[PDB]
């Protein structure tokens, strides 16, 4: 309803309801071709990064990685109701790669466990 | 933690633990755009082929296609413990199109069965 990035200044709990609005605007002479290839590569890298986490095809993907209190010692009543996604993105610029590595490792363990359970007669 | 293709000489059972290390290195004047477009096209053909099989979003995908002993008569103690993926690829390359066709047909039958199961009130 608010359009692309319209919820950027709203709280992240409210901005979480506009994920499809943001997603639809990521895909749409030599400079035009380079720009289009670059947009495709950024989209595909984000989709691969979601895929290796078991979040393919989802915009809201819950995981089984616990939140470390050292990453951000805040309550949900403060993170989701009184903070925006931009402020959060600034706050956890550090530790983002730690979270991504833990998500990748958790998905590898989940894929092995699912393979062993499905192979269990 | 062995790096890109570090597990290339490891056994298949050990090399299957590094699927994300190889997967994350598949995406990253007109000569360079041709190179980038070909990399994107190869990635998308592999992802579409996984999707056709019902394996989208997974690196280890279990299927309902029985293994034909004529494709390879080795047991699991030989394929996974004393063989690398390169040797296996050399042995199975004659039969991978039959396997791919069977995977596609099996997923089409699975999709029709799921649609009929979801049509029961």
């Amino acid at each position, epitope marked *: 309803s608010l359009g692309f990035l319209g919820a950027a200044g709203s709280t992240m709990g409210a901005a979480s309801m506009t994920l499809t609005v943001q997603a639809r605007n990521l895909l749409s002479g030599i400079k035009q071709l380079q720009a289009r290839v670059l947009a495709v590569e950024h989209y595909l890298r984000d989709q691969q990064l979601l895929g290796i986490w078991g979040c393919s095809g989802k915009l809201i993907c819950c995981t089984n990685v616990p939140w470390n209190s050292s990453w951000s010692n805040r309550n949900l009543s403060e993170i989701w109701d009184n903070m925006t996604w931009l402020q959060w993105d600034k706050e956890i610029s550090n530790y983002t790669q730690i979270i991504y590595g833990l998500l990748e490792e958790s998905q590898n*363990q989940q894929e*092995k*466990n699912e*393979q*062993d*359970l*499905l*192979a*269990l*007669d | 933690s062995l790096g890109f293709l570090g597990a290339a000489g490891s056994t*298949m*059972g050990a090399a*299957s633990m590094t699927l994300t290390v190889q997967a994350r290195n598949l995406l990253s004047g007109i000569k360079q755009l041709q190179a980038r477009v070909l990399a994107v096209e190869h990635y998308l053909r592999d992802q579409q082929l996984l999707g056709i099989w019902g394996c989208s979003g997974k690196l280890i995908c279990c299927t309902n296609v029985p293994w034909n002993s004529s494709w390879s008569n080795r*047991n*699991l*103690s030989e394929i*996974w*413990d004393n063989m690398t993926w390169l040797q296996w690829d050399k042995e199975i390359s004659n039969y991978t199109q039959i396997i791919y066709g069977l995977l596609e047909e099996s997923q089409n039958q699975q999709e029709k069965n799921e649609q009929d199961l979801l049509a029961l009130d």
Partner: antibody, heavy 123, light 109 residues
């Protein structure tokens, strides 16, 4: 191959008891492990099964809310913590290999190597 | 769940059989049927697995079979040292993993 349990009896039912099992002579991390119950006057009863990695645990319904099974692949040990023990749980609890294979090995569905009993009494 | 009649007896040099009865959802559906031989004071060492297979390190006088919803253990060259409590074990599925019968005492005169 050797399996050596560490354990003992318990008094005042309703408490908890930690049992353990040490393995030697084979690669511990390559095999699934289980605990099997044998009361002195009854036959064998399967109680718990853990896979080779340790991520998957299975129990009989009667102990799903009582028993926790875990394994340490660095010390090559099992640890079974039994809560809310009752007098009817007096039995010899054996540590054993096997019970499943993790999809890339030939299946077993059997217990080949057995321990000597945790010798657990309840009073 | 499994039925194992007690008080089985025999003599050296004669064959004996020990029966095991299950149902259509476990013995009939799976081939994962195993047999154990427990001497008093000793661990129930595995003797038979996968109906017809034996592990390395045991005598070949022990064998077995499965038919219908039943299974059996056969000993041909019965020895005086085979007096023991035998157990039948079967895989029941994913919801229930293993089922056992009662102990079968085999005695040798």
């Amino acid at each position: 191959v050797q399996l050596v349990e560490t354990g003992g009896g318990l008094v005042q039912p309703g408490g908890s008891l930690k049992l353990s099992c040490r393995a030697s002579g084979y690669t511990f991390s390559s095999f699934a492990m289980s605990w099997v119950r044998q009361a002195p006057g009854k036959g064998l009863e399967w109680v718990s099964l853990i896979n080779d990695r340790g991520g998957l645990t299975f129990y009989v319904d009667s102990v799903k809310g009582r028993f926790t099974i875990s394994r340490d692949n660095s010390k090559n040990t099992l640890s079974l913590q039994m809560h809310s023990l009752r007098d009817g749980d007096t039995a010899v609890y054996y540590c054993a290999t096997g019970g499943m294979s993790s999809a890339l090995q030939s299946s077993k569905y059997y217990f080949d190597f057995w321990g000597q009993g945790a010798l657990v009494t309840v009073s | 769940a499994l039925t194992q009649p007690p008080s089985v007896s025999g003599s050296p040099g004669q064959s004996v059989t020990i029966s095991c009865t299950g149902t259509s959802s476990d013995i009939g559906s799976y081939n994962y049927v195993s047999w154990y031989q427990q001497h008093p004071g000793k661990a129930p060492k595995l003797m038979i697995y996968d109906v017809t297979q034996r592990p390395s390190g045991v005598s070949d006088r022990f064998s077995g079979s499965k038919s219908g919803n039943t299974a059996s253990l056969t000993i041909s060259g019965l020895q005086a040292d085979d007096e023991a409590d035998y157990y039948c074990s079967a895989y029941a599925g994913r919801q229930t993993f293993y089922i056992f019968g009662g102990g079968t005492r085999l005695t040798v005169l």
